[PDB]
Amino acid sequence: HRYRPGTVALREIRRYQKSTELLIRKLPFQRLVREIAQDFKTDLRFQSSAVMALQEASEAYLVGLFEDTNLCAIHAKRVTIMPKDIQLARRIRGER
Amino acid sequence: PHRYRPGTVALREIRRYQKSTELLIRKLPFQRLVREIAQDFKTDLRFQSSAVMALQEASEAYLVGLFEDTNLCAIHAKRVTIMPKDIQLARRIRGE
Amino acid sequence: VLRDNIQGITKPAIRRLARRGGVKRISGLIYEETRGVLKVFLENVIRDAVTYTEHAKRKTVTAMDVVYALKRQGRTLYGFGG
Amino acid sequence: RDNIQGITKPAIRRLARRGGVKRISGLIYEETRGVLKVFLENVIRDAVTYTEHAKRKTVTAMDVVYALKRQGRTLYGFGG
Amino acid sequence: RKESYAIYVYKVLKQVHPDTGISSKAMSIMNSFVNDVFERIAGEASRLAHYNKRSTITSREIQTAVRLLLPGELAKHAVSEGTKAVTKYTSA
Amino acid sequence: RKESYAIYVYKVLKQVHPDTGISSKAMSIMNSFVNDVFERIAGEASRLAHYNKRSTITSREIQTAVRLLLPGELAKHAVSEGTKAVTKYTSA
Amino acid sequence: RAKAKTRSSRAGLQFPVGRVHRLLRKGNYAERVGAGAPVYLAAVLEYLTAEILELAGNAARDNKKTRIIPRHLQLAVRNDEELNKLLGRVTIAQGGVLPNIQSVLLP
Amino acid sequence: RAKAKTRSSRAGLQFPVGRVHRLLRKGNYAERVGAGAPVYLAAVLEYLTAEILELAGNAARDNKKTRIIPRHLQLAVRNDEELNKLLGRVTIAQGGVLPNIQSVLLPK
DNA sequence: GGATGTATATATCTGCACGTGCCTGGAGACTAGGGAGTAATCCCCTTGGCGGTTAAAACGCGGGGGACAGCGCGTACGTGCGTTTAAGCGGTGCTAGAGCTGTCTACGACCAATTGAGCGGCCTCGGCACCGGGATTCTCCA
DNA sequence: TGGAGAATCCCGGTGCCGAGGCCGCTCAATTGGTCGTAGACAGCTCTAGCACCGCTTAAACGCACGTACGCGCTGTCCCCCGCGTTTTAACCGCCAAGGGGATTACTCCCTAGTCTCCAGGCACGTGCCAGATATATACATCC
């Protein structure tokens, strides 16, 4: 049948907060890292641990930013996050 | 008689206290507060005048930055009035 | 023994500090929260300043101790030496 | 080129589900991609500077750890 | 021949949780934790020695660094453990 | 007795703005700025020398410390006057 | 020469006093390093490691496992206020996040 | 002997090369300090001092003032993006804040 | 009250902890020199007090405007399902280059003599804070 | 939309004190030579990183319904802003005690440095126990 809008989201919240696995696919992130590093030095090599460290740091930073974004959405009496909440979180954090 | 609308004196005060560099807390109550706080750590303690001046400058700068973030949080909730929940949101996003 | 000096940080002083922060309208429960925030911040700086004083075996808290305490919490202060 | 689209919509959805977000707007994903690009540009630029100081052509994990420690984002588990 | 704190965290773990093991990534994390805490305390003691025009690091500087770094109960118990260690080292 | 960057920043001010002076508090703030930026660059260069197993701080260490610490155009320009000053010092 | 008794054994410690003294000496911290500074420092590090391993072992036994994983270390650090204050700017690899859902999101 | 030519004079600098050199030796940074490192560091510090001082003099001239006060240093640092990024966690004493009233607070 | 996600229990299989040989770094023992403890002194500077004065805080009161609750509505994500696609795992191969070792030489620490630039002290003049009066916005109400 | 009261901006006069320049000197920078070692360079090696292929399959992607929910509008009423008057304590000037911070002398014990030596710690190797996987039953949610 059809579930209500929100219960699969809450089930996914309870699922992904119980796990440690990386939520971004490895090859697109590695290609993005090599695309970004091409502007700084031509013909660079990467260890696998370097890309894994970058992915772990990026995923932790994005999860914390989405927690602050969720606070900013709740503060405006909303359960939906919006780009203004991300901008406000980065403004209070000092990143903008 | 003559009575200004609510908000004009507030904006005039915003311009006046943003153009100035004076300390906005009275020095003697801040000094008494500093001695009262410091007496809980080490009794029979003295203070230089420049130490209390440094504490006053740091405290005023911290409170002004906190009130800027509080005003941003109040604007984000479609308001012009600052409330304690805005202070709590700004402090938890900063991580204090 | 100094007692209850947090009321010396008055409501007009908190209003002036909010005016410097660009605030047009202030609620009435703001002042107690601002006093608590100020007390927490001053306790955090003053504890490190007293610790720097006690390491130097002095009875006076110098300005340079407060500068070191503020440089510890990422709140470096310019104008009192360093 | 155009590898920022590899960070797909369900990847950002999973990252927000780990953050506790129940509902996500459709304009969230481009904003999150820009945030990720800025963060990766900062860390990768610092790590490339650390690599070229050592006269190497391989970005080690040690360079990434020092690049993150420069920005107050200390990472435990990759040789730190 | 890279040196690490692996056998020591093994010894502490078997000293307090005898029927409990540890993994390789967890020991990389604990080694990074010990190195980071070491760097914080040693850097704060170096700053403490430079501020007081002293050229030596003693137990007083590391104690003050522990008081500056660690939160309250952690700082109190670390001060107590280290003072016990220094008194036992001097007494023996 | 006490040492500060008092006459030098005055010399730089008269080089840049020859009809503009300075106050004592602005002097103390500029002295604190020079001391803090010096501490940042020297600490980063010390960390860079320790990371690459080197016991010497060279102009390369200061160059990559400026590239790490300063933002973009500031870093590019500061590398340019640093290289110019080192070249003029070595050539004469 | 007498029996070589280590400085960790006569201080009653498990962390190496000699290795901590060597890393203090060549770490360019001060011109000199006293005798009691590596003993005090190794005691403090041993105490902090012991606290982390106590809470990580409790978190491992809570998940019915006898081997400490990074998730157990993350739960140990972030479930204590003082260890979260000490390790606030620290990302633990393969640690995840703790289960927290805001009360306005529940049905 | 020869004439005592200052190391800052042969490097084309106003900041002292020798004082940066003694502060690098006695600051516990490395066992060895090279010859070009204090020249490079004094040049970088002099460039940053000139960059702040030019903008502070412009801010003092725009306020019809001759001498530079900490308000002008604060305006110079906060009005430049790179200087505000460099000096973002630093409070200038007697510096004040930038004039910034939000758009939703102004009357219509 | 019926229909699905998920503990719980049992077999099974594979990819951390104990043992050992070398080796190298910590420990014992001694010397040398200088960093810091300790006593004495003295002078800045911190604290406590008194009094006038006046500026700022506190209290009260009127009123208006904005925060908050309720309600309608149109739309845009949530969820589900079928289709596509490229992540991922396993495998092969090849060449860059990370890392180790050896040799030599340039370069920075170190020491002693010299001397001059920077710092403390002092004196004096102009930038600016303040005051008073007039010209020009500027906000609110008829 | 015009106009009155309030506020802000602007120009001339006055004094004051802090910046700016001059001088003595002293200590710290410079110069010259020596020496030991850190690092630059050359060679080699073998390790891990990159490039491509095949498959199979999980995950990304397109699309449709629909329902909740973000957002705009309206009323109301309470809370905070503006202003006037009284009170109160901040602030400035001054005047003393006296703790204590800063400096100097000395003297001693503590730590750097060195030679020797052995035992703890690390790399390598192996075999065995802890989780990961798969399937059926009932417990826990969901509509």
Number of compact structural domains in chain E: 1
Name subunits touching D (3+ CB pairs < 8 A). A, E, F, G
How many H-runs (helices) and E-runs (strands) does chain D carry?
3, 3
Best CA proximity match to B87, nearest among B63, B65, B70, B75: B70
D14: nt with nearest C1' to CA: J59
In a domain, F1, yes or no: no
Alpha helices for chain E (secondary structure H): 6-16, 24-51, 59-69, 72-91
Write the DSSP string, A57-78.
Answer: HHHHHHHHHHHHHHHHHHHTT-
- Residue E57 belongs to domain with CATH number: 1.10.20.10
* Domain spanning D1-80: CATH superfamily: Histone, subunit A (1.10.20.10)
Other C-beta atoms lying within 10 Å of the C-beta of residue G72: 26
- 3-class secondary-structure state, position B82: strand
Please check whether residue C61 is in contact with residue C50, taking contact to mean a CB–CB distance below 8 angstroms. Answer: yes
Please check whether residue B51 is in contact with residue C53, taking contact to mean a CB–CB distance below 8 angstroms. Answer: no
Which residues in chain B have their CB less than 8 angstroms from residue H95's CB? 21
For residue D8, what are the CA distances in angstroms to A29, A82, D15? 10, 18, 11
- Residue B65 belongs to domain with CATH number: 1.10.20.10
Resolution (angstroms) stands at 2.8
For residue C26, what are the CA distances in angstroms to C34, C38, E27? 12, 17, 52
Rounded Cα–Cα distance for residues E63 and E79 (Å) = 6
Name subunits touching A (3+ CB pairs < 8 A). B, D, G
In G1-107, the DSSP E strands lie at: 32-33, 67-68, 90-92
| Cross-chain residue pair D20–G102, CB shorter than 8 Å | yes
Which residues in chain F have their CB less than 8 angstroms from residue H85's CB? 71
Write the DSSP string, chain F.
Answer: ----SHHHHHHHHHHH-TT----HHHHHHHHHHHHHHHHHHHHHHHHHHHHTT-SEE-HHHHHHHHHHHS-HHHHHHHHHHHHHHHHHHHH-
F7 CB contact with strand I at below 7 Å: yes
Rounded Cα–Cα distance for residues B10 and C24 (Å) = 6
From the CA of A78, how many Å to the C1' of J140? 30
Structure-token match 């697109």, residue found: A28
From the CA of A7, how many Å to the C1' of J142? 9
Q: Beta partners for H101?
A: none
For residue H14, what are the CA distances in angstroms to B80, D10, H41? 51, 58, 12
Say how many residues make up chain C. Answer: 82
Please check whether residue C77 is in contact with residue B54, taking contact to mean a CB–CB distance below 8 angstroms. Answer: yes
Does C75 contact F at CB distance below 8 Å? no
Domains of chain G, start order: 1-107 (1.10.20.10)
Query: What number of C-beta contacts closer than 8 Å exist between F and H?
Result: 182
Q: Beta partners for F56?
A: H32
Does D73 contact E at CB distance below 8 Å? no
Please check whether residue H92 is in contact with residue H74, taking contact to mean a CB–CB distance below 8 angstroms. Answer: yes
Does H76 contact F at CB distance below 8 Å? no
Please check whether residue H34 is in contact with residue H21, taking contact to mean a CB–CB distance below 8 angstroms. Answer: no
Convert chain C into a string of H (helix), E (strand) and C (coil).
Answer: CCCCCHHHCCHHHHHHHHHHCCCCEECCCHHHHHHHHHHHHHHHHHHHHHHHHHHCCCCEECHHHHHHHHHHCCCEEECCCC
Does H40 contact G at CB distance below 8 Å? no
Does G31 contact H at CB distance below 8 Å? yes
In a domain, E16, yes or no: no
Other C-beta atoms lying within 10 Å of the C-beta of residue E14: 15
Rounded Cα–Cα distance for residues A8 and G98 (Å) = 19
Number of compact structural domains in chain B: 1
Say how many residues make up chain D. Answer: 80
The dihedral formed by the CA atoms of G44, E79, B54 and B43, expressed in degrees to the nearest 10: 180
Handedness of CA C5, C10, C14, C20 (dihedral sign): negative
Method: cryo-EM
Structure-block tokens of residue F4? 């500060």
Alpha helices for chain A (secondary structure H): 7-16, 26-37, 48-75, 83-93
Task: Indicate the domain borders of chain C.
Answer: 1-82
- Which residue of E lies nearest to H23 if distances are taken between CA atoms? E50
Rounded Cα–Cα distance for residues H23 and C19 (Å) = 43
Rounded Cα–Cα distance for residues H17 and H64 (Å) = 36
Other C-beta atoms lying within 10 Å of the C-beta of residue A69: 30
Please check whether residue E38 is in contact with residue G38, taking contact to mean a CB–CB distance below 8 angstroms. Answer: no
* Domain spanning C1-82: CATH superfamily: Histone, subunit A (1.10.20.10)
Please state the separation of Cα D46 from the chain's center in Å. Answer: 12
Rounded Cα–Cα distance for residues C43 and G18 (Å) = 38
Which residues in chain E have their CB less than 8 angstroms from residue G83's CB? 74
Q: Beta partners for H33?
A: F57
Structure-block tokens of residue C29? 């429960």
Other C-beta atoms lying within 10 Å of the C-beta of residue B48: 16
Structure-token match 């130490």, residue found: B51
Mutate to test the interface with H, among F9, F14, F35 (most CBs of H within 10 A): F9
Rounded Cα–Cα distance for residues A8 and A16 (Å) = 12
Residues of G (10-39) whose Cβ lies below 8 Å from D: none
H7 CB contact with strand I at below 7 Å: no
Nucleotides of chain I in contact with protein CB (under 7 A) are 3-6, 16-18, 24-29, 35-36, 45-47, 56-58, 63-68, 76-80, 86-88, 96-99, 107-109, 114-120, 127-129, 139-141
Other C-beta atoms lying within 10 Å of the C-beta of residue G26: 12
Q: Residue E49: which domain range?
A: 22-91
Which helix (H) or strand (E) is H40 found in, with range? helix H36-62
Taking CB atoms within 8 Å and a gap of at least 24, the contacts of F75-80 are F77/H47, F78/H43, F78/H44, F78/H47, F78/H48
Q: Residue A49: which domain range?
A: 1-96
Structure-token match 């005023």, residue found: B60
Please state the separation of Cα E84 from the chain's center in Å. Answer: 14
In a domain, E82, yes or no: yes
Which residues in chain G have their CB less than 8 angstroms from residue D18's CB? 96-97
Determine the distance in angstroms separating the CA of H4 from the nearest CA of chain B, rounded to an integer. 41
* F56-57 and H32-33 strand pairing: parallel
